Amino acid sequence: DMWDETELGLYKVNEYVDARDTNMGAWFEAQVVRVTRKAPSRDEPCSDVIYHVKYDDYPENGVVQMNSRDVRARARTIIKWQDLEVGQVVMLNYNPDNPKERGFWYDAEISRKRETRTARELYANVVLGDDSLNDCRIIFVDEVFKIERP
Numbered sequence: 001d002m003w004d005e006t007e008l009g010l011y012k013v014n015e016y017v018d019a020r021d022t023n024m025g026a027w028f029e030a031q032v033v034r035v036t037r038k039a040p041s042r043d044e045p046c047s048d049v050i051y052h053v054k055y056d057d058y059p060e061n062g063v064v065q066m067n068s069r070d071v072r073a074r075a076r077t078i079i080k081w082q083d084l085e086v087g088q089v090v091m092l093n094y095n096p097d098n099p100k101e102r103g104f105w106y107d108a109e110i111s112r113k114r115e116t117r118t119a120r121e122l123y124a125n126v127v128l129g130d131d132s133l134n135d136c137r138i139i140f141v142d143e144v145f146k147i148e149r150p
């Protein structure tokens, strides 16, 4: 059984978060509607939460259960071009199917960062996690966000 949990969650009921969609790996704004933990044993004291969220722009998907690694405070600060560097882990916009076009917001690890006379080159390992897309050219180099880690 799922038990409602009021203490362990970093995020609380009614709070808005970014949540990572289980099917395609991008982050979307969502509201936390419930926070739960697995029931403890009868003979064990209470002392990792499951968040239950509803996406702001996709209410038709209903309430969805999220691992704690797939919920975080809403992105709010851009890392400007001058401050980006290889090895940073960031949230950026990429379209895996049409890479020249606007897409969705994914975690990424910067793999190349160079400015030449001709171009500002930013490459990153995108959809970081299982089957990440390695060394992708990033178009939207002025819209790279810091990941919030409260």
Ligand SMILES: OC[C@H]1O[C@@H](O)[C@H](O)[C@@H](O)[C@@H]1O
Binding pocket: 022, 061, 062, 063, 064, 065, 066
């Ligand atoms: O977390 C549960 C939810 O996961 C979603 O991916 C499914 O589309 C829903 O049918 C389901 O209720």
Ligand SMILES: Cc1ccnc(C)c1
Binding pocket: 021, 024, 028, 055, 058, 061
């Ligand atoms: C457009 C889109 C795609 C995948 N997941 C969500 C929540 C929205």
Ligand SMILES: Cc1ccnc(C)c1
Binding pocket: 018, 027, 028, 029, 074, 075, 076, 105
């Ligand atoms: C642009 C943006 C800002 C904050 N969160 C997300 C998912 C996207």
